[PDB]
Amino acid sequence: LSRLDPPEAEVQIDRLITGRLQSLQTYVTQQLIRAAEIRASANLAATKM
Amino acid sequence: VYADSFVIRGNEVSQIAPGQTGNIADYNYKLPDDFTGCVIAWNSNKLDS
């Protein structure tokens, strides 16, 4: 926002936002998978308890 | 529909675009970043010279 011009730097900001959104979505997916695994392990541990 | 009119140089018409910089694009006539429409220009040496 200091080097390039506003109208032509909008595509760069859009691409950065898309990349960060994808990098956060894959992290959310990994967290969901690990949370399901932890839930299964906790159910097994409660059954054993 | 809104129509604006002005007279500028030949190569100076390149500054007539959304978000440009220059003596005209910043101090005489600035277009918004989300501008939509058409820009029409032609020679006027037969009348304005």
Swiss-Prot record, chain A:
The entry's stated outcome for S2A is:
In strain: Alpha/B.1.1.7
State the protein's purpose. Answer: Subunit of the fusion protein that is processed upon entry into the host cell. Mediates fusion of the virion and cellular membranes by functioning as a class I viral fusion protein. Contains a viral fusion peptide that is unmasked after S2 cleavage. This cleavage can occur at the cell membrane by host TMPRSS2 or during endocytosis by host CSTL. In either case, this triggers an extensive and irreversible conformational change that leads to fusion of the viral envelope with the cellular cytoplasmic membrane, releasing viral genomic RNA into the host cell cytoplasm.
Q: What is this protein called?
A: Spike protein S2'
Organism, scientific name: Severe acute respiratory syndrome coronavirus 2 (2019-nCoV)
The lineage, from the top, is: Viruses, Riboviria, Orthornavirae, Pisuviricota, Pisoniviricetes
